[model samples]
Target: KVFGRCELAAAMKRHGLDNYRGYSLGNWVCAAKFESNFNTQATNRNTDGSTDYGILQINSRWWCNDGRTPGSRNLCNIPCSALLSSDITASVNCAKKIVSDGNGMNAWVAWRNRCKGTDVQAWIRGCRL
Candidate 1:
């Protein structure tokens, strides 16, 4: 399912992403917007043979086990398949793992380039958190 702006924001907040690890809710909303435009089933194949999956587009080469990415660490201990299909629990948790592991939110380049050090209030302006 493709989540609307406030819908995605609320879902992330409910999963404890509100101000998670010193990153504001807007930061996450902004990141997801760039990563997948809030589409839970989104997938993008990289030229290097790895794929990014789900709303946050967790990379298969390290975070999820897609059985296709060579040298996958499977760090999040989940199947890339689970990251799709519109249920966000897995995505949110895996994102948390990525943020806590010394990578911060920079693991997603879109987030680093788009959301880093920016005032992201516009991303969640109307959300009733």
Candidate 2:
């Protein structure tokens, strides 16, 4: 199911994403917006032949196991299919590990290309977080 923007904000807040890894809620929300449009089952194949999984678009090249993809580091130790779920706890956990690895929001190209340095308040304009 695609989540409403406010609902996504609440879920992110409930997951304790406020100021996570030095990123604000706005950063997280904006990244998710561009990456997956709040859809739990979002996936996209990159030109590099890697598949990005879930809302944060965690890549099969490094983070999750896409059964058909070779050379996947699977660093998150999770099946890529696990990311495509309404319950996002696993995806969020993996994202936390990613941020801890020092890439921060830069790990998500969507953040760098669209969200970074942009007006982020729109991500939570009417949210109650």
Candidate 3:
């Protein structure tokens, strides 16, 4: 339950997001509701060309290998129980940066938008409710 619905909301708030919910809002819930089911610790691995890992669906190989932080490089640092297992903020933010190419959430949104859709709420709704 690391990246569960409630945890996703917590992650958004911790990062200073405000428009992630409500009908008129970005409806971030839409993303959480459908993608990964709002699980912050959620991970996806497949050969469908959309293989992703962790809440942000980061590429494990990239983020875990040379893409990893100053720490280990064998697993997607953010999803590894030994890494983000206790620090959600660190995990989410880092994942956001990696997916967004070092732009943090903004980059995360841009990247997510490419696959999903755009809307501040789409990134925050799950947290608000």
Query: Between which residue pairs do clashes occur in model 2?
Result: none
Best by lDDT: 1
Query: Where does model 1 exceed 4 Å of error?
Result: none
Worst 10-residue lDDT window for candidate 3 reads 18-27
Whole-model lDDT, model 3: 0.45
Q: Which runs in model 2 stand beyond 4 Å of their true positions?
A: none
Residue-wise C-alpha lDDT for candidate 3, range 1-129, written one tens digit per residue: 545555556655566443322122233334444545555556554453333444544554445432433333443454443222444455445544453454433334423564344554444444544
Judge candidate 3 at residue 29 and give its lDDT: 38
The estimated TM-scores of all candidates read 0.96, 0.95, 0.47
Cα-based lDDT at residue 111, candidate 3: 39
Q: Report, for every candidate in turn, its global Cα lDDT versus the true structure.
A: 0.92, 0.88, 0.45
